[PDB]
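Holo prediction. Input below; ligand is protoporphyrin IX containing FE.
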Amino acid sequence: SFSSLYKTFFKRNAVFVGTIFAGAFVFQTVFDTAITSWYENHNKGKLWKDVKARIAA
Amino acid sequence: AEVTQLSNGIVVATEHNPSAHTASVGVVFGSGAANENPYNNGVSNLWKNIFLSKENSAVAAKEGLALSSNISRDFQSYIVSSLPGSTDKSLDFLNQSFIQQKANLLSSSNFEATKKSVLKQVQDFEENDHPNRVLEHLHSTAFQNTPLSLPTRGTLESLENLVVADLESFANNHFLNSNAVVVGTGNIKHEDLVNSIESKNLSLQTGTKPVLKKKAAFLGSEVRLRDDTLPKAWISLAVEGEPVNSPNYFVAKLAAQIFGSYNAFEPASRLQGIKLLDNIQEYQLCDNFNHFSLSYKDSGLWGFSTATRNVTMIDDLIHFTLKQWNRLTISVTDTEVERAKSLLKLQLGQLYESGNPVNDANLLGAEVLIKGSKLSLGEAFKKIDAITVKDVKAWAGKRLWDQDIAIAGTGQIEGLLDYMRIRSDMSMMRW
Amino acid sequence: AYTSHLSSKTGLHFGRLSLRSLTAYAPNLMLWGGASMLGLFVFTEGWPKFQDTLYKKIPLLGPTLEDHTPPEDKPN
Amino acid sequence: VTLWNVGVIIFILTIATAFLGYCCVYGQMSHWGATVITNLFSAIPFVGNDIVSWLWGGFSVSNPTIQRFFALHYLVPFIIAAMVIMHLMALHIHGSSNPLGITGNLDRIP
Amino acid sequence: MAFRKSNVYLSLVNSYIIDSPQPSSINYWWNMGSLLGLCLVIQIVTGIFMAMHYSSNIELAFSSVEHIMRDVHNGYILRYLHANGASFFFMVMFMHMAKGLYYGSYRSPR
Amino acid sequence: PQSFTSIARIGDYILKSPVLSKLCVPVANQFINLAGYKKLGLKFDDLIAEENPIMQTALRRLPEDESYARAYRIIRAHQTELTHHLLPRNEWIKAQEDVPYLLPYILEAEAAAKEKDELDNIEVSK
Amino acid sequence: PQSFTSIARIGDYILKSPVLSKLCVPVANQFINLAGYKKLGLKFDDLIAEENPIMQTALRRLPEDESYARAYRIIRAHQTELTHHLLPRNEWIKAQEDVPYLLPYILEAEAAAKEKDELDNIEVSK
Amino acid sequence: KSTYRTPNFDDVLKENNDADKGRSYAYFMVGAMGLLSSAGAKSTVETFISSMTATADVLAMA
Amino acid sequence: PEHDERKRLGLKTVIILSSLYLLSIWVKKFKWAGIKTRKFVFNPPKPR
Ligand SMILES: CCCCCCCCCCCCCCCC(=O)OC[C@H](COP(=O)([O-])OCC[N+](C)(C)C)OC(=O)CCCCCCCCCCCCCCC
Ligand SMILES: CCCCCCCCCCCCCCCC(=O)OC[C@H](COP(=O)(O)OCCN)OC(=O)CCCCCCCCCCCCCCC
Ligand code: HEM
Ligand code: HEM
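Structure of the complex:
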């Protein structure tokens, strides 16, 4: 089942660079939101939204 | 019109062309120069030159015969061409001096003289026959460490340690009766042939040749024997092609005939229907090139073999013909397909029909050994004209787009860029 | 039978190209057009007009681009 | 035609840097010519105001536009110099013409 | 012949960065020149995009540098890339010179 | 830029029809002697641009005497344009010796290259 | 940069004297074995810089077998330093076969060039 | 040693010389490098031309 | 004031660049696998 994968993805270069660009789209967006979610959960209570909810409650 | 009958042992194959003169009876074995190990190599060429020696040829010439032999990479042949009214003489000579006792052929005077002449002509072939030796090095590096890699003539280092024990062991292990096919071309009828093979009892052995452990697998490789003494630069690159009795065989020969063969000094080969000759004719990038398609029993090659006096622009010739190879997959036309169809029909007709009845004997023996019965010239022509452009595009996407190549060079080939550029110029980014 | 001539005729060309070139090239050239539009799709994701017009109308990747800041916490 | 196209590229870059140099002196013709040229450069339908407030660096011709225009007025002549080198290469690989149209390879002068 | 060897600019780019025959046994110390070229292009690019905001008076030099550091978008990135790529430029240059005077490439043909 | 077969076709059709001939060739003769390439001592087929492949083969197929006379006329035109004079009245190319000498070679060379271009774009009936 | 006749006269004065030979030849042997050019499969006469004219004439005057073996040893050194390995213990150049095969040719070439530059600045009796 | 007998490569080779499997593996690796470098090149180009937009004091006094 | 955004973009950039460094080491070893493992054989030629 590797011949079908090679035929539909890496045979012609146009679908190769199109796959690379669409993967760049979805990778950049989910990588950005995942790394900012981790960076804002590693600091809990130190961010401004947490301080604002703390002084609002 | 090409009739085949299986007897008690042997398979008889014949074709009766009643207008030809010299009828030619011989036996074609199915054990060539790829059915041995690399240490007893050249025993097939040594057997051929033992059969063609002075003793045997004087015995055959006193009666009115003329011996022939041809060693290839899976079949080897022993042909006794003769006059048409004299073929029972051919048959009982081939019985009495090759199939039964060979003690007159295999004593240490005739064998010593034959081995010395074979050593001299093999080293003369190695020094002074340059395109055939790089086709041979292409075969030796394409299928390496695997029994199709062997030299046909044999190497010098594995030919000076051969005695009569090697030849007797090879004649016991490969000159069998479930391995042999007797052939008749020229103007012998079929039934007098088998009548004379069944009157006098002719059977070599009974057993079966040893089957090989390793099948022929392509390994994408590279080799260069750069000798800058030589005035030219003989390189040849080739991919894995389709073997014999494969469905994509005639499309491989047609895709070879698409690009054809060329000769830069004849004014009638400079005007062909190739698109490559508008790229390689303004700086004279080569002297000749020929696109072969060899198909052995297990696998085969597909590529071109050139010669270049302009040793600085070697990489441009390689790059231009490889872009022309990628044109097979992406944008091959239909007028190239029909031109190659007619030219392939012409080439196969020039190969199958010719004046010499020993080449027809070799081809008939090979394609009755491997297939079982000979397909005619009509069915081959029908299978040729049943080829559409999309079959060529499918085969070229199967076996030519970004596949591993093997290169073999000699001469002044520093201008040949090294391997990864040539490998990754087999696939372009769609222009 | 016997063919006395060649019953064949020229194609449609402009010297450098022809119709047989563009007929065999056109699926890969429309794929190259799609790949080029995808390339500048990913190259202009930070452009806010294409961001709020097109790059949130994507079904499930949509709410990852916007981040919900209350309006009483920005300087402008 | 390589020489002619590279010359047209130098012509475009020269018009550009002369415009930027005229708009970095900041007189009355300078500022108003800059804002009229970019205000007609905001005629592109989808991205016009976006690219013109990216080019202004603000909301009209002001201090960031003048600093930007001085930096570009340096920078474009040192692209023009490399384009002049390319102009000279594209000339030198074919030789100059002569005011007759006939070939010059017969009688030449160092 | 090929178009990358026929066209005059592409023949230069070909003969310098495509099929320039490099010796077969060079190690990772010979890549410092490519690193120096990349870092020089980095210095020039970040310098232009900082000089679009830097004003060079005596009352505005340090204030304009800390205006780049605080108010322009991603200006901290540009100033730290310039001020640290200069140090990395000189360290890769010291490695280039020390390779050149260790491996004997000051010698008779260069 | 324009093929000489097309120029020859339009010129033959203008020439061998008697209504257009007596209207078109006098203004053509006046345009030629107003152009002034004969005052420098030149035939017309030196003026053609020699940087096409068609013109290069049509020059390499030229005979050995007309090639040397052509090179001399080009060099003499170069020199008398250098000194910003004209050739004297004895050394002007007369109208009867403004014979097209390069034009058969140009026509047959462009016919050969044209036939190659439409032989390799041919299609069999499918 | 240093001519080989100078190195030759210094080395022959060191070797033919008794008190310096057995006190400077062991440290020279240990220096050559510590340099490690033999582990790559190289004699010393491959290590010499070639971009002199003297070394160019001395390499064109080499016999046609030693030139082929020298090219093979240089290419094998290039490859076995490309792999960042060393040659195996059976293919190291032994100390018995580091003979100078190039030094007579370089000595005759530099003697010829020294005689040429000595003859070009000759002074007859004044 | 003959010139047709190749030296051993059986340590640097693989057991299954499949065309599609090895080619797909190599092209997936070069495509992953191209994907990461494409996202990086996009982000650094939009960094460099996001520097040239309106500075925060101009957006404040808008 | 650039502390939070600087360390966040640093995390992004060094993750992307270290993954690119590992993938580029792999593609360098792939492109040089044909050069690290070539073998030279020299038999001495016959004299003329
Ligand atoms: C501008 C100078 C500073 C910037 C300078 C940047 C560095 C110098 C320019 C590098 C640009 C690289 C472009 C590569 C072009 C190309 O041919 O890509 C094809 C590759 C795969 O190609 P392949 O490995 O040969 O395989 C093809 C064989 N098949 C699979 C068809 C069987 O597919 C891929 O490579 C995947 C796509 C990766 C996209 C490239 C990422 C970097 C883009 C930079 C673009 C810069 C150019 C902008 C021009 C306005
Ligand atoms: C490898 C490539 C080399 C060539 C580089 C040039 C090509 C660039 C293509 C476009 C890149 C993305 C643009 C959006 C990013 C952005 O503009 O940012 C988003 C900004 C606002 O940002 P913010 O303040 O909300 O951000 C806060 C957090 N950073 O909106 C704008 O500025 C609107 C104006 C658009 C400016 C770019 C328009 C094109 C300029 C010329 C480019 C040359 C094109 C040449 C084509 C032949
Ligand atoms: C910065 C500006 C320019 C410089 C320094 C420059 C330099 C030169 C030089 C030195 C020559 C050779 C001398 C000559 O042949 O006349 C030349 C020739 C030429 N330039 Fe330019 N040039 C510039 C702009 C242009 C422009 C704008 C064009 C037109 C688009 C152009 C088109 C040409 C042409 C066609 C020639 C060839 C003339 C011939 O040989 O007949 N140049 N240039
Ligand atoms: C040879 C390459 C270059 C080097 C080594 C270099 C080095 C430096 C250094 C060390 C500084 C001081 C940074 C600090 O304050 O610590 C600096 C400042 C500066 N450089 Fe460069 N520079 C180079 C090229 C350029 C170029 C070409 C420009 C203009 C386009 C430029 C623009 C600036 C500016 C505007 C400053 C001001 C202070 C700042 O904002 O950093 N640089 N340079």
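The helical segments of chain C are 19-43, 48-53. That is the main takeaway for now.
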